[PDB]
Amino acid sequence: ISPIFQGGSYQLNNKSIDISSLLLDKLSGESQTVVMKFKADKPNSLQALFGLSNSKAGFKNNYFSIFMRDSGEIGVEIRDAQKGINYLFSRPASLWGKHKGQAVENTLVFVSDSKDKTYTMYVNGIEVFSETVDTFLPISNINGIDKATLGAVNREGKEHYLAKGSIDEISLFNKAISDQEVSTIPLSNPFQLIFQSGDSTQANYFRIPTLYTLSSGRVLSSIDARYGGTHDSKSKINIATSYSDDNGKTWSEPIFAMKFNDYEEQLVYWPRDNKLKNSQISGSASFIDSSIVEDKKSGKTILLADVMPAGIGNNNANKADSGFKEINGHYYLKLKKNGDNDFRYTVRENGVVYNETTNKPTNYTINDKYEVLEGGKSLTVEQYSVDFDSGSLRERHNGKQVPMNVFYKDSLFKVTPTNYIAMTTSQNRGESWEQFKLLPPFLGEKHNGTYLCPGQGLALKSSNRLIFATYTSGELTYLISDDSGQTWKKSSASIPFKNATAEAQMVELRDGVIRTFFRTTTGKIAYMTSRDSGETWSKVSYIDGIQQTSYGTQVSAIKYSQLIDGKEAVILSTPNSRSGRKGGQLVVGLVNKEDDSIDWKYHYGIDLPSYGYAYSAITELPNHHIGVLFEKYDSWSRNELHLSNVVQYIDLEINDLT
Ligand SMILES: CC(=O)N[C@@H]1[C@@H](O)[C@@H](F)[C@](F)(C(=O)O)O[C@H]1[C@H](O)[C@H](O)CO
Ligand SMILES: O=S(=O)(O)[C@]1(CNC2CCCCC2)C[C@@H](O)[C@@H](O)C1
């Protein structure tokens, strides 16, 4: 259909533009679509881009508006006092502000559908809300509407929500256009999606991105595919991967690197209201926080992640049990059988389930997928699905049988309810992943697993050594393998904070010299240095010049392959803010060869200081551009839970950063 109105290049400079004469007599019927291309790189705290209002005294609550906040939130109001209707729909973190120094042209599509009684908002090709109501209010059937406005809402003759920005294009249609038609509207996005709602993972949410550039030039990414909203474990979460063979321009359909089947892979719209938003999947096993490295020796790609048994997360994991029994300098996974009060079993060589009370083997074995076999035959359990049909979260059996896994709630044999680390490998650079194996405990029988630092592991230039940073109370625990991940040893490095989420990432400054940058509880990013390929570690220092919150955020870090200003360069990615996870920056540091000190010389702002930026992944692409995959929202904020399609990917050149 044709638009009933189309206009453009409106500058909103804290003074509204009246388009009543052009628009109001064109509005007809009860369904409308608004399409708007706009920029706002310096928005006011709360501002309206478009308004339709009754501007008369006594009718201040009769208006429709499309509004935004300087947090990046988008929303609408639809109000009529005579009808007794006051709708407010919005979603945080829906907008872009600036990219590479330039204001971003956001593409907004709002559909008001009287027949389905549904209001739907898309921004930049992403559906940010879709709300169905019992009593529908058509946006141009509000009582006594007499003003159509850009850059404010006229209430009782005064300009409310004055906007700073520009509306380069605005069209309106007397029709609710289909999702199909919506997808044909050209976009001007500065980003792309790798993982997204509706893809092969069927997770509606994603967090904890990684990126790693392989020797073939293929670029690999991993992520938490989070099913039960954006919550950390306990939940249902799988690890998914995708790769690009063309310097990040296009990405493969995701596959799983690590997955559990005890719960169905459901795409669910997790509730965001204050009563239900903390609803949390409570009986599923999960994986969380992945990290990738490539091994020179075998050519294999290696991926580690934390593993949580059914209903377990960092909050309730048994801190005083590794889940393994030491028997002769060897560690065996402990198991509890249905009905026993203690763990009277172990998994020994070739997966034989052994009875500890009698040191007899049983007729049970554990296969390579940690599935239970009796006499060589597969045992099964019934799968669960989740729903909010009753008005609160329910988890119930769905009729489907899946292989019985020792990490499952319904298993005959169950592992210790604590956290573990697993590894899987790929022989084809991420086209398929092997079945995962658990790493051994590194801090003794009576200490829970360390926590893997998400991002990249480190492959040293001059050897086959592989290192993965992990953290626990009071230290960083580096996991080191010299044999393609077949065996591991730890190298502990004390840090002066207890209870820190000390997520750490490493760069090799020069041969055998490793600097680790890590999250702390001090509001500053810290670092330590090894000069013997991770064997021993220095005291902890801090970076001034970058601020984090008291709780901190993951920091990603790479060593750039090319000189910058004639010097070796390190690039950090992190929010730069004392207040929240926002103000994303890449920070370029030049190395002083005299003492390996780093002078942080350039700060590139990824978007506005007030727009969200949390966990991130960076990697040097084979063409020497920088790829960044990041959480574009505040993943700490309890107001920004359960948002879809906020983990986004951008491509930057060094000239953009300097
Ligand atoms: C293993 C685990 O639970 N890792 C998660 C991350 O995946 C991330 F999600 C994050 F929460 C965060 O700071 O955002 O950190 C932790 C965690 O939930 C808590 O912060 C601390 O218990
Ligand atoms: O130097 S590596 O540790 O092998 C690595 C890749 N380097 C290439 C060198 C050539 C340009 C692309 C990046 C850096 C880490 O961030 C991982 O991406 C792997």
| 3-state secondary structure string across 526-585 | EEEEECCCCCCCCCCEECCCCCCCCCCCCCEEEECCCCECCECEEEEEEECCCCCCECEE
Tokens of 291: 């990290």
Q: For the purposes of burial, counting CB atoms within 10 Å of the CB of 517, is it exposed (0-12), middle (13-18) or buried (19 or more)?
A: buried
Name the residue of 207, 226, 307, 314 to mutate for ligand 1: max ligand atoms within 8 A of Cβ: 314
Q: Which helix (H) or strand (E) holds 21?
A: helix 20-23
304 DSSP β-pair partners:
291, 423
Taken in order 289, 515, 298, 365, the sign of the CA dihedral is negative
Q: Which residues are catalytic?
A: 232, 503, 615
Query: What 3-state DSSP class applies to 207?
Result: strand
Distance CA 268, CA 377 (A): 34
Query: Do residues 57 and 156 lie in contact, with contact meaning Cβ atoms separated by under 8 Å?
Result: yes
Q: Are strands 164-173 and 63-69 parallel, antiparallel or unpaired?
A: unpaired
Distance CA 653, CA 326 (A): 51
> Which residues have C-beta within 8 Å of that of residue 348, sequence separation ≥ 6?
332, 354, 361
Distance CA 387, CA 372 (A): 28
In order of 53, 235, 345, 374, 619, the CA distances from 560 in angstroms are 54, 37, 50, 53, 9
The neighbour count for residue 197, using CB atoms within 10 Å, is 17
Residue found by looking up tokens 């390579």 in the block: 368
Query: What 3-state DSSP class applies to 24?
Result: helix
Distance CA 616, CA 140 (A): 43
Method used to solve the structure: X-ray
Q: Which atom number of ligand 1 is nearest to the Cα of residue 306?
A: 1
Spacing, Cα 573 to ligand 1 middle (Å): 18
Distance CA 110, CA 538 (A): 55
Query: Do residues 531 and 568 lie in contact, with contact meaning Cβ atoms separated by under 8 Å?
Result: no
Q: For the purposes of burial, counting CB atoms within 10 Å of the CB of 385, is it exposed (0-12), middle (13-18) or buried (19 or more)?
A: middle
Query: Do residues 161 and 149 lie in contact, with contact meaning Cβ atoms separated by under 8 Å?
Result: no
Instruction: Please give the single-letter amino acid code of residue 250.
Output: T
The neighbour count for residue 372, using CB atoms within 10 Å, is 25
89 DSSP β-pair partners:
76
DSSP secondary structure letter of residue 115? T
Query: Do residues 304 and 457 lie in contact, with contact meaning Cβ atoms separated by under 8 Å?
Result: yes
Distance CA 486, CA 300 (A): 12
Tokens of 516: 């680790």
Query: Do residues 219 and 202 lie in contact, with contact meaning Cβ atoms separated by under 8 Å?
Result: no
In order of 133, 208, 335, 342, 404, the CA distances from 355 in angstroms are 59, 39, 9, 12, 19
Distance CA 627, CA 556 (A): 12
Domain edges within the chain:
1-190, 191-319+418-658, 320-417
Question: Ligand 2 pocket, 558 CB below 6 A?
Answer: yes
Nearest C-alpha neighbor of 107 from the set 170, 14, 21: 170
Tokens of 139: 């946006």
Helices and strands, counts by H and E, the chain: 3, 52
Nearest CA to ligand 2 atom 5: 213
Tokens of 119: 């209001």
Query: Do residues 63 and 79 lie in contact, with contact meaning Cβ atoms separated by under 8 Å?
Result: yes
In order of 161, 210, 278, 648, the CA distances from 266 in angstroms are 40, 23, 18, 22
The second-level CATH assignment, the architecture, of 191-319+418-658 is 6 Propeller (2.120)
Is there a cis peptide before residue 249, judged by omega within 30 degrees of 0?
Answer: no
Query: Do residues 50 and 68 lie in contact, with contact meaning Cβ atoms separated by under 8 Å?
Result: no
Spacing, Cα 174 to ligand 1 middle (Å): 47
Tokens of 289: 């926080």
Q: For the purposes of burial, counting CB atoms within 10 Å of the CB of 4, is it exposed (0-12), middle (13-18) or buried (19 or more)?
A: middle
Least distant ligand from the CA of 205: 1
Tokens of 118: 């549904």
Residue 610 phi, psi dihedral angles, 5° rounding: -95, -10
Q: Are strands 286-294 and 455-456 parallel, antiparallel or unpaired?
A: parallel
Nearest C-alpha neighbor of 130 from the set 59, 56, 182, 57: 182
Spacing, Cα 231 to ligand 1 middle (Å): 9
DSSP secondary structure letter of residue 228? S
Question: Ligand 1 pocket, 314 CB below 6 A?
Answer: yes
Q: Which atom number of ligand 1 is nearest to the Cα of residue 551?
A: 13
Spacing, Cα 211 to ligand 2 middle (Å): 10
The second-level CATH assignment, the architecture, of 1-190 is Sandwich (2.60)
578 is in an annotated binding site: no
Distance CA 446, CA 466 (A): 26
581 is in an annotated binding site: yes
Instruction: Please give the single-letter amino acid code of residue 398.
Output: N
Tokens of 135: 């009593």
Q: Which atom number of ligand 2 is nearest to the Cα of residue 213?
A: 18
429 is in an annotated binding site: no
Instruction: Please give the single-letter amino acid code of residue 361.
Output: P
Q: Where are the alpha helices (DSSP H) in 97-252?
A: 179-182
The neighbour count for residue 426, using CB atoms within 10 Å, is 22
Distance CA 644, CA 127 (A): 8
Resolution at which this structure was determined, Å: 2.0
320-417 homologous superfamily = Intramolecular Trans-sialidase; Domain 3 (2.40.220.10)
